[PDB]
Amino acid sequence: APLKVCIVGSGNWGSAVAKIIGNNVKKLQKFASTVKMWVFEETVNGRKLTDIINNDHENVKYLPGHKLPENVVAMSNLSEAVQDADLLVFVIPHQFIHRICDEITGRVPKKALGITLIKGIDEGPEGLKLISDIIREKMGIDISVLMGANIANEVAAEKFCETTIGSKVMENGLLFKELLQTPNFRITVVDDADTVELCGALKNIVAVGAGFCDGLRCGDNTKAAVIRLGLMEMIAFARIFCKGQVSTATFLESCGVADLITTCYGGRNRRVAEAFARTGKTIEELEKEMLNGQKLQGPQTSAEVYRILKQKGLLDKFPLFTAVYQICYESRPVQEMLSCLQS
Amino acid sequence: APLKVCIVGSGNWGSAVAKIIGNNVKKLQKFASTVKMWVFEETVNGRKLTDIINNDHENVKYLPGHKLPENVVAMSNLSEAVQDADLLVFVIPHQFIHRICDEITGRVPKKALGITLIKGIDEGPEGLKLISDIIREKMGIDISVLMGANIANEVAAEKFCETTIGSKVMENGLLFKELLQTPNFRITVVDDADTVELCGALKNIVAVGAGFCDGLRCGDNTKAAVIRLGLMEMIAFARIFCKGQVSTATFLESCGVADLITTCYGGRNRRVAEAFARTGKTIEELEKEMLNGQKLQGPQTSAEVYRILKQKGLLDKFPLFTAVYQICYESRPVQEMLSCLQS
Ligand SMILES: NC(=O)c1ccc[n+]([C@@H]2O[C@H](COP(=O)([O-])OP(=O)(O)OC[C@H]3O[C@@H](n4cnc5c(N)ncnc54)[C@H](O)[C@@H]3O)[C@@H](O)[C@H]2O)c1
Ligand SMILES: NC(=O)c1ccc[n+]([C@@H]2O[C@H](COP(=O)([O-])OP(=O)(O)OC[C@H]3O[C@@H](n4cnc5c(N)ncnc54)[C@H](O)[C@@H]3O)[C@@H](O)[C@H]2O)c1
Ligand SMILES: [Cl-]
**Cβ neighbours of A157 in B, within 8 Å:** 219
Phi and psi at residue B250, to the nearest 5°: -60, -35
Three-state DSSP at B98 gives helix
What is the layout of strands, in order, in the sheet containing B185-190? B72-75, B35-38, B5-8, B87-90, B113-116, B142-147, B161-166, B185-190
Task: Give the C-alpha separation, A210 to B295, whole Å.
Answer: 30
Angstrom CA distances, A196 to A94, A168, B169, stand at 16, 11, 38
Task: Give the C-alpha separation, A255 to A199, whole Å.
Answer: 6
Is position B339 annotated in a ligand binding site?
no
DSSP output for A206-225: HHHHHHHHHHTT--HHHHHH
Same domain, A256 and A179: no
- Ligand nearest to the CA of residue A156, numbered in listed order: 1
Same domain, B250 and B181: no
What pairing do the DSSP bridges indicate for beta strands A35-38 and B128-130?
unpaired
* Cβ B87 vs Cβ B179: under 8 Å: yes
- Compute how many other C-beta atoms are within 10 angstroms of the C-beta atom of residue B273: 31
Number of A to B CB contacts under 8 A, please give it. Answer: 138
Same domain, A170 and A208: no
* Cβ B296 vs Cβ B269: under 8 Å: yes
Same domain, A158 and A201: no
Give chain B's radius of gyration (CA, Å): 20
Task: Look at residues B142, B146, B151 and name the one whose alpha carbon lies nearest to residue B181.
Answer: B146
Chain center to CA of B317? 26
Q: What angle do CA B187, B189, B193 make, to 5 degrees?
A: 120
Q: Which of A191, A217, A236 is the last residue of a domain?
A: A191
Task: For residue A156, give the H/E element and its range.
Answer: helix A152-156
* Cβ A143 vs Cβ A91: under 8 Å: no
Task: Look at residues A233, A235, A216, A190 and name the one whose alpha carbon lies nearest to residue A273.
Answer: A216
What pairing do the DSSP bridges indicate for beta strands A47-48 and A43-44?
antiparallel
CATH code for the domain of B68:
3.40.50.720
Same domain, B187 and B197: no
B155 Cβ contact partners less than 8 Å away, ≥ 6 residues apart: A221, B16, B20, B161, B185
Same domain, B185 and B214: no
What pairing do the DSSP bridges indicate for beta strands A35-38 and A43-44?
unpaired
* Cβ B76 vs Cβ B50: under 8 Å: yes
B318 Cβ contact partners less than 8 Å away, ≥ 6 residues apart: B233, B236, B237, B305, B309
Q: What angle do CA A262, A117, A73 make, to 5 degrees?
A: 115
Same domain, A125 and A263: no
| Total structural domains within chain A | 2
Q: What residues make up the domain containing A294?
A: 192-343
CATH code for the domain of B222:
1.10.1040.10
Task: Give the C-alpha separation, B222 to B228, whole Å.
Answer: 10
Q: Inter-axis angle of helices B170-180 and B12-26, to 10 degrees?
A: 90
* Cβ A144 vs Cβ A114: under 8 Å: yes
Nearest CB neighbour to A232, from listed B154, B219, B252? B252
Q: What is the DSSP letter of A3?
A: B
Same domain, B208 and B336: yes
Is position A254 annotated in a ligand binding site?
no
Three-state DSSP at B30 gives coil
Three-state DSSP at B116 gives strand
Phi and psi at residue A263, to the nearest 5°: -65, -40
Same domain, B202 and B278: yes
Is B220 in contact with A259 (Cβ distance < 8 A)? no
Q: Which of B191, B211, B229 is the last residue of a domain?
A: B191
Same domain, B170 and B285: no
Of all protein residues, whose CA lies closest to atom 8 belonging to ligand 1? A13
Task: Give the C-alpha separation, A210 to A337, whole Å.
Answer: 9
Same domain, A133 and A272: no
Strands (E), chain B: 5-8, 35-38, 43-44, 47-48, 72-75, 87-90, 113-116, 121-123, 128-130, 142-147, 161-166, 185-190
Give chain A's radius of gyration (CA, Å): 20
Q: Which of B191, B215, B244 is the last residue of a domain?
A: B191
Is A150 in contact with B223 (Cβ distance < 8 A)? no
- Compute how many other C-beta atoms are within 10 angstroms of the C-beta atom of residue B326: 18
Angstrom CA distances, A245 to A96, A192, A240, A250, B197, stand at 31, 9, 10, 11, 31
Half-sphere exposure of A58 (CA within 13 A, CB side): 8
| A186, closest residue in chain B (CA to CA) | B342
* Cβ B139 vs Cβ B105: under 8 Å: yes
Task: Give the C-alpha separation, B302 to B97, whole Å.
Answer: 18
Task: For residue A205, give the H/E element and its range.
Answer: helix A193-215
Same domain, A89 and A224: no
A77 Cβ contact partners less than 8 Å away, ≥ 6 residues apart: none
Task: Give the C-alpha separation, A23 to A25, whole Å.
Answer: 6
Structure method: X-ray
